Ligand binder design. Structure first.
Ligand SMILES: Nc1ncnc2c1ncn2[C@@H]1O[C@H](COP(=O)(O)OP(=O)(O)O)[C@@H](O)[C@H]1O
Ligand SMILES: Nc1ncnc2c1ncn2[C@@H]1O[C@H](COP(=O)(O)OP(=O)(O)O)[C@@H](O)[C@H]1O
Ligand SMILES: Nc1ccn([C@@H]2O[C@H](CO)[C@@H](O)C2(F)F)c(=O)n1
Ligand SMILES: Nc1ccn([C@@H]2O[C@H](CO)[C@@H](O)C2(F)F)c(=O)n1
Lengths: 225, 242
């Protein structure tokens, strides 16, 4: 009965910032952050930084990173469903989804030859299975797309200052942007999860310096779900 | 499940497939879940329902061969897929087989425990997986078992014990191309892990119940006809104790 809403958008578009603001509007609203800390310090529960490994050597580490990213996200999202919210109208906001993991990030890595055909096939097979098992419980009721230009995202990468991200080129951001636009705006990106074609999407332009009006728009989008 | 789950464990080419697939014919209540080795030598994922009507399901890469060719590069990828594909196969067979059975027994060719505590652990110990890869692997394995371990918990283990030299010979007999370069020393390492886990029982796992699970050890060094009778008798007696 918990409504599940994914917040999507490019690197440093402002998803964590936005969701952390939204969280405060209701005791009925909780958030599942992307497990970036678990990626920056790998631990089985200081370790290696697999996000860094992927950025420094993507042909070596893209598959390993992408698999772990998605595993860690599934674990976090399932844990939050099982234990959060007891709430009048519970809403869980996910920072990104298993779908952007596969159809945006992992897909772009395969397209750029950072994963080979075997790696991509294994990834998709693992993902298909993981979702046949957990798909239902994690299925989205809606998507919020925070749309920012690649140039805005590059600037915010610098503002945030995560060391591993400082070397990301504009072109890499452009590719991620076109994928987001294809999925969420043009709706030309085909997934093997049929229900997604029906999930409503609220697109919010976040290119400007921070916002109140965007927040209000969410509160009301949720009343339609 | 009322289905008893029994894992058959043993080194490469010890004779687990050969033995269990003959043994299972002794009762309509007995079935086997094979190890998904074919899925590893021909990597494939599911086709779209419309695409498959006009496009063949093509041969994929061989991740088993990739692991043997360059273990420091491919061990993590291989081990992760091996265990995922195993859990999928074992869970589907638990959910779908042996409905009509009086005393159902499902035999698993190897287990998620040997994947982690024998194979993947040996790869880590040999520096074919680094610290990050090993941490990720164990993290994922722990999580998968918190979710699925209960359905897959074993009622017993049958350890097929063969010397590394016997296994090396049987690898040649079987003729799997990607196994043909395996050195005796690799087989000996796997042998010692099996012995520590299943014979001496000193190997510590993250899974409490395993220290207690009944184990039957069978010497499979002889030619098949020479001991089969004695093995079958030992198995039936063992099953009656669970
Ligand atoms: N609308 C905005 N205007 C100015 N700065 C923003 C805005 N949104 C986010 N930021 C800043 O940009 C950086 C990235 O935002 P963050 O929420 O971490 O992005 P994401 O979660 O999408 O990766 C942070 O330093 C944040 O303070
Ligand atoms: N007891 C035995 N005596 C002679 N050959 C055996 C015996 N057990 C197995 N083999 C042969 O050894 C090879 C490996 O057997 P297999 O069952 O595929 O091993 P595993 O499943 O343990 O990897 C095969 O060629 C098989 O015919
Ligand atoms: N599946 C995913 C998910 C996220 N990321 C990357 O993780 C960092 C934090 O959002 C960002 O650097 C990132 F978004 F790029 C990724 O590469 N692949
Ligand atoms: N977790 C596992 C499981 C098995 N294997 C390998 O798969 C082949 C078939 O048993 C054998 O070549 C093998 F047993 F070695 C592996 O390397 N790691």
């Amino acid at each position: 009965r918990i409504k599940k809403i994914s917040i999507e958008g490019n690197i440093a578009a402002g998803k964590s910032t936005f969701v952390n603001i939204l969280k405060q509007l209701s005791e009925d609203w909780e958030v599942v952050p992307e497990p970036v800390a678990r990626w920056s310090n790998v631990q089985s529960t200081n370790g290696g930084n697999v996000l860094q490994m992927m950025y420094e050597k993507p042909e070596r580490w893209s598959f390993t990173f992408q698999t772990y990213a998605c595993l860690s996200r599934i674990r976090a999202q399932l844990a939050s469903l099982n234990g959060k919210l007891d709430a009048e109208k519970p809403v869980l906001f996910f920072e990104r989804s298993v779908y952007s993991d596969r159809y945006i990030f992992a897909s772009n890595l395969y397209e750029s030859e950072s994963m080979n055909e075997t790696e991509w096939t294994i990834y998709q097979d693992w993902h298909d299975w993981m979702n046949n098992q957990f798909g239902q419980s994690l299925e989205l009721d809606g998507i919020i797309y925070l749309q920012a230009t690649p140039e805005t995202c590059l600037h915010r990468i610098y503002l945030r200052g995560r060391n591993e991200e400082q070397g990301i080129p504009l072109e890499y951001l452009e590719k991620l942007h076109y994928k987001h636009e294809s999925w969420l705006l043009h709706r030309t990106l085909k997934t093997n999860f049929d229900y997604l074609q029906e999930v409503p999407i609220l697109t919010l332009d976040v290119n400007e310096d921070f916002y109140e009006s965007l927040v209000e728009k969410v509160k009301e989008f949720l009343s339609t779900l």
